[PDB]
Amino acid sequence: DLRLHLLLNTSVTCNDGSPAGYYLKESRGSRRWLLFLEGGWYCFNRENCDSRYDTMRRLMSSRDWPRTRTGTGILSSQPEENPYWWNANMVFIPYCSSDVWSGASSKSEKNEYAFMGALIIQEVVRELLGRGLSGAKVLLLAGSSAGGTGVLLNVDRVAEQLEKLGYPAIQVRGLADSGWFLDNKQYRTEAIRRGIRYWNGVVPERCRRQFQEGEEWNCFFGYKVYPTLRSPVFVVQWLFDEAQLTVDNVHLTGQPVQEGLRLYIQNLGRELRHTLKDVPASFAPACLSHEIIIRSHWTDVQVKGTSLPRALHCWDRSLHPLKGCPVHLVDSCPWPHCNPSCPT
Numbered sequence: 355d356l357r358l359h360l361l362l363n364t365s366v367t368c369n370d371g372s373p374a375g376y377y378l379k380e381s382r383g384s385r386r387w388l389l390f391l392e393g394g395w396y397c398f399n400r401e402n403c404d405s406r407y408d409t410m411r412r413l414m415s416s417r418d419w420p421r422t423r424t425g426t427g428i429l430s431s432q433p434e435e436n437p438y439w440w441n442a443n444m445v446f447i448p449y450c451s452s453d454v455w456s457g458a459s460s461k462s463e464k465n466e467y468a469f470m471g472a473l474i475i476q477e478v479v480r481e482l483l484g485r486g487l488s489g490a491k492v493l494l495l496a497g498s499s500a501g502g503t504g505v506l507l508n509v510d511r512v513a514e515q516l517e518k519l520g521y522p523a524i525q526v527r528g529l530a531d532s533g534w535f536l537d538n539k540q541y542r543t544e545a546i547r548r549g550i551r552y553w554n555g556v557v558p559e560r561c562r563r564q565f566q567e568g569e570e571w572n573c574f575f576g577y578k579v580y581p582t583l584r585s586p587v588f589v590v591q592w593l594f595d596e597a598q599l600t601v602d603n604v605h606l607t608g609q610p611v612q613e614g615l616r617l618y619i620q621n622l623g624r625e626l627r628h629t630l631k632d633v634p635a636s637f638a639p640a641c642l643s644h645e646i647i648i649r650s651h652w653t654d655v656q657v658k659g660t661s662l663p664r665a666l667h668c669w670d671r672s673l674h675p676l677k678g679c680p681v682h683l684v685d686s687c688p689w690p691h692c693n694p695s696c697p698t
């Protein structure tokens with residue numbers, strides 16, 4: 355189990371003004387630290403955020419959080435479940451800012467909600483330095499869904515923070531799971547643009563300088579922000595991601611898929627594969643699914659005979675090509691479940 359700690363700086367808050375926090379399990383014999391960002395969509399105006407507060411309140415408030423949480427998948431401490439990093443120090447950061455981890459705005463007389471995701475990450479890192487992070491050799495910032503996009507938006511800021519604080523020896527890296535989306539045409543971007551204004555959202559500096567004022571929404575799309583980043587980032591993305599298909603208005607019912615939808619789905623997979631061609635650390639199976647790294651059976655899927663925990667181990671070796679230890683693993687077959695190892 356990982357144990358809850360509420361932030362000592364109580365000005366860094368969830369949406370409703372309650373303190374943000376993190377869950378921690380220390381591993382005294384390890385200099386590896388894994389910090390995982392939870393996902394869970396977002397909200398982008400007063401009415402939409404009010405609705406989320408009625409029925410998704412744990413994603414907006416710490417008042418009802420439990421004292422402990424069980425680590426699963428990459429957060430498990432058992433080697434059978436986690437062949438990659440089972441002995442690491444484990445941190446789960448709850449998503450309670452509804453801002454894709456981008457916000458820097460407090461609750462006040464003018465703002466019904468606080469959007470502080472970018473500041474929550476920085477404050478967690480600062481408070482962990484007194485609990486052993488100061489001795490780390492590697493800090494892996496990981497995340498799923500909105501948390502995977504959050505990795506892309508925040509990994510270089512964590513690296514800059516540790517450099518300015520006097521810890522240049524800590525190697526900061528990212529692992530973005532299910533957060534690499536396409537700004538494509540629907541089968542049958544404005545919400546992000548609205549959200550950034552509502553949240554006072556912030557994006558990485560080099561990407562901001564390319565796209566300039568009013569166009570910062572572009573930096574939420576992986577294929578546009580990734581080339582601007584300096585820290586090493588491993589990208590995990592299903593080729594037929596269920597969240598991508600939902601926003602594209604695609605719903606599979608079991609009836610025969612006709613030609614127009616067949617071509618739409620095939621072109622989506624081809625476009626995703628194209629955006630990953632120049633991403634040297636990546637894992638992209640031809641499956642219809644969403645999220646993987648904190649699932650207990652994350653060990654089961656393979657691309658070209660290599661599992662995700664193996665690919666991450668090969669990535670670690672590469673950061674010290676490798677015979678029999680690949681790091682770039684993208685399926686080429688063109689339809690969901692053409693890979694036999696896809697989740698059932």
Ligand SMILES: Cn1sc(=O)n(Cc2ccccc2)c1=O
Nearest residue numbers: 454503535536574575597598601
């Ligand atoms: C395909 N999809 S899915 C989704 O949620 N969005 C909006 C969004 C984009 C980047 C980061 C967070 C949210 C898309 O364009």
Ligand SMILES: *[C@@H]1O[C@H](CO)[C@@H](O)[C@H](O)[C@H]1NC(C)=O
Nearest residue numbers: 363364365366473474476477
């Ligand atoms: C608490 O957090 C706020 C917001 O990031 C910051 O302005 C302030 O300096 C912090 N205070 C301390 C003591 O860390």
